[PDB]
């Protein structure tokens, strides 16, 4: 339809700058949808997203990380989930302000997905529906513990060697991202590597305090994030309307997939039954 983008900014934790876009559709929303992307992108990734959801009436507000895009911080520097989840709390108590009376729809894809989970264990009642793009939250003890050590004492500190290639079948989707000047093109650092695991090692005991209804979304051939922690997660969370939407044969980034319409067609179709 014609949908409309702003770009505001709010003060995180640290007093860093974060941006954020404002995508509004020309027409009453029916709701709003905070999102939150995942690790080395950034907000302006989710264009077609934002503009697909404004055609059904819902307003999206998207924000750049800290250390990621337009944001303030060392590129990919983080510290402790919190420092997302405060920022990712701070931006939807912003669309409460500016919608109130609409329901709120937090979405979040790999990393992104695993901030949202660990926002939504923390504040339950504070948002209506979640809606996970392969969501980074299932992530031997001495491995775990040692990875949470190194990320407190040098967060910045490369670790892992991420395939960039596996995002998506979409060639154009591939290099898109390797040719980006705001994309993060290195290892993944230690302090990402523990925040992780922060919401991996506590996601089985805490799943429970979700409430509001959820779906996740996921290819079977993710090589980056595995579909059967998806699997896990739907038999955790204390969530009562709950359910996993498979893609076979596609990679991690179904909303960039060629099969991307469909998916998003997918989750319209879900919000709407719930909206």
């Given at each position: 339809m014609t949908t409309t983008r702003t770009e505001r900014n709010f003060a995180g934790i640290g007093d860093v700058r974060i941006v954020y876009d404002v995508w509004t559709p020309d027409?009453?929303?029916?709701a709003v949808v905070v999102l939150a992307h995942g690790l080395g992108e950034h907000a302006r990734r989710y264009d077609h997203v934002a503009q697909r959801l404004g055609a059904a009436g819902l307003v999206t507000y998207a924000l750049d990380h800290r250390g990621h895009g337009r944001s303030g911080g060392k590129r990919v520097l983080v510290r402790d989930i919190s420092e997302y989840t405060a920022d990712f709390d701070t931006l939807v108590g912003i669309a409460t302000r500016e919608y109130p009376g609409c329901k709120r729809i937090v979405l979040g894809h790999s990393m992104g997905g695993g901030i949202v989970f660990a926002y939504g264990v923390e504040?339950?009642?504070?948002?209506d529906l979640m809606v996970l793009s392969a969501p980074a939250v299932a992530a031997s003890p001495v491995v775990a513990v040692a990875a949470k050590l190194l990320g407190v004492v040098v967060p910045g500190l490369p670790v892992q060697e991420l395939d960039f290639?596996?995002?998506?079948?979409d060639p154009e989707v591939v290099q898109a991202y390797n040719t980006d000047p705001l994309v993060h093109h290195g290892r993944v650092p230690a302090g990402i590597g523990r925040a992780l695991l922060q919401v991996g090692e506590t996601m089985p005991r805490r799943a429970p305090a979700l409430t509001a209804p959820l779906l996740v979304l996921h290819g079977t051939d993710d090589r980056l994030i595995p579909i059967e922690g998806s699997r896990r997660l739907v038999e955790c969370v204390?969530?009562?309307?709950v359910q996993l939407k498979e893609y076979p044969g596609?990679?991690?980034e179904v909303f960039n997939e060629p099969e991307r319409n469909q998916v998003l067609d997918d989750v319209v179709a879900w919000l709407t039954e719930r909206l």
């Open positions: 027409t009453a929303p029916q504040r339950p009642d504070n948002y290639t596996a995002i998506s079948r204390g969530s009562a309307d596609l990679y991690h």
